[PDB]
């Protein structure tokens, strides 16, 4: 598997979302629930959902 990094800043829109900045890295936990992946921030340690389109590998 691979870590993903944010291509752009994102502000959470739902309570299950994470907010994040460009360059923040994520461990992806689940991608089977549509475009928003469940992930863990390698900056904050928090788990939540993030838009896959906002991310790229490495």
From Swiss-Prot:
Compartments where found: Cytoplasm; Nucleus; Cell membrane; Perikaryon
Residues spanning the membrane: none
Domain SH3: 2-58
Tissue/organ expression: Thymus and spleen.
Family: Belongs to the protein kinase superfamily. Tyr protein kinase family. SRC subfamily.
Role noted for this protein: Tyrosine-protein kinase implicated in the control of cell growth. Plays a role in the regulation of intracellular calcium levels. Required in brain development and mature brain function with important roles in the regulation of axon growth, axon guidance, and neurite extension. Role in CNTN1-mediated signaling.
Subunit comment: Associates through its SH3 domain, to the p85 subunit of phosphatidylinositol 3-kinase.
Protein name: Tyrosine-protein kinase Fyn
Organism: Gallus gallus (Chicken)
Residues represented out of the complete protein: 85 to 141 of 534
């Amino acid at each position: 598997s691979t870590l993903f990094e944010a291509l752009y800043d994102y502000e959470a829109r739902t309570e299950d979302d994470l907010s994040f900045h460009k360059g923040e890295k994520f461990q992806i936990l689940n991608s089977s629930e549509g475009d928003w992946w469940e992930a863990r921030s390698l900056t904050t340690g928090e788990t939540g959902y993030i838009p896959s389109i906002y991310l790229a590998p490495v």
